[PDB]
Amino acid sequence: SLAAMYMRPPVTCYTDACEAPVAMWDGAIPLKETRKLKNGVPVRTVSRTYSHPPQLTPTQLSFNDINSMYCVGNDELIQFFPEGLGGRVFQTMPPGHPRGFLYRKETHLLNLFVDKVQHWHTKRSVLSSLTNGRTGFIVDGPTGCGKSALMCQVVHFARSRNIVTLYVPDAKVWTHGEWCWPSTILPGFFDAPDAARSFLKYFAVANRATLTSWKLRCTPKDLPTEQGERQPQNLYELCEWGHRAVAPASIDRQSVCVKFLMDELSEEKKLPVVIVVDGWNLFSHETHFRYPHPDFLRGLASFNESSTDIDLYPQELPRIPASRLSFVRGLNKMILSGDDPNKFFITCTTRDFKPFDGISGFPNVETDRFANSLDEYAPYDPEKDSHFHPIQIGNFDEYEYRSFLRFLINSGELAGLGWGPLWHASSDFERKLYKIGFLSGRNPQGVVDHYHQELVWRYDYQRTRQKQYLLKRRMEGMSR
């Protein structure tokens, strides 16, 4: 066997170092003898029949890369995505497995759009025609498509080209967060401190280089500051001041900071700004929070006789619309009010909800798969519910699906997460790809799920039949 003859090639990038020990994946990934004239004298070395997709920067991506795979380094992910990733997009890249992305056809279009945004001032007319006068793009499609992956790639493109980008990877933490607190200085407005504290910290470190050069245009110079801390004369220092406080003093610390940050950001008309908001459909309707009962802000002396029933029966009060949040107020103001031709919104419509069709019994507490997913049950239409130009994206075509499946199976088996020594216990690549197409319906979310469920397949006789044929041929050869 071609096992001891193989030595690992020199490691150039993080992707090359994700190779499992040779003995484990020798069966899964066969090796072949490659001959070439190395410095005159020909040399014949054994090499793998498969290699990971090359890792290359977004500026190196081209038209020929459409419907192909490309990897991103671990250090690049750390410096580009401190806010996190999409809800279900990171589960395909465990720490050992290399981080890959599919350069979709829509990805190329958005890569070009971000490229124009780099210097939009020279091509304002070009971008206006692309957006058709709208303030950005909103991406909608069937549940489990690559809409969140598109947003992650967009943020990668923006940060690689050094454009200040406001990233909201999860809209659940804002609209359907843990608790909501009224705004400190904005009457009739609320905010979510749990999401705001993390958002400010991640946004600051994400755009540390860009925001450092920024200067405050509309910001009070006499804001409260504890001993040892310095008044923020820089936008990045303002962001740090927003979250560098001990609770409960941080609640109002972020409440004023988020409003001033939005106001200062809206007061910029030259530097391009890119906004990426995953799950924008949560920002256009009511939040799951409820307005407080009026008896809670009235004061009760004797509960037994106070003409109140808050402690008797629970009741439903109107829900807070997402437009009443301090964070969302800035975004709505930029979208509606004109005179802001440098803000570019790229938003997604998450459709991860608890299934419901007629009857709905109590889900099993253990086997539930949509338990963590939020539930709204409200039909959504981005064309009528958003000001951005709608982009309809469907499931993978078989070209993209084949590349996605090839990357998942082979890179995982090369990284040391596949069958490895048990390669003969799984069907061939074409048989697996054919089965996954039927099982998953060529759905990006279904592909990874059925790839994981591949081992539990019971009805697949190809390997047993192939073993039987090989044994029969070997016996005939021994007889001869």
Binding site: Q315, E316, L317, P318, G358
Partner: protein
């Protein structure tokens, strides 16, 4: 939520029609029915087992 159900009179309407409550009262006149005043509006449940 808790609310008081309004009743817009056809005379007060910009263009008069026949209100659903008026038609239901006519139905109760036609067939001798019983209007349960204390019937809650939040307990309208469909027997999904047999429906």
């Amino acid at each position: 939520g808790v609310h008081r159900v309004g009743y817009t009179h056809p005379s007060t309407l910009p263009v008069p029609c026949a209100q659903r409550w008026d038609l239901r009262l006519a139905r109760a006149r036609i067939f001798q029915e019983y209007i349960e005043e204390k019937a809650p509006g939040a307990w309208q449940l469909e027997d999904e087992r047999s429906m």
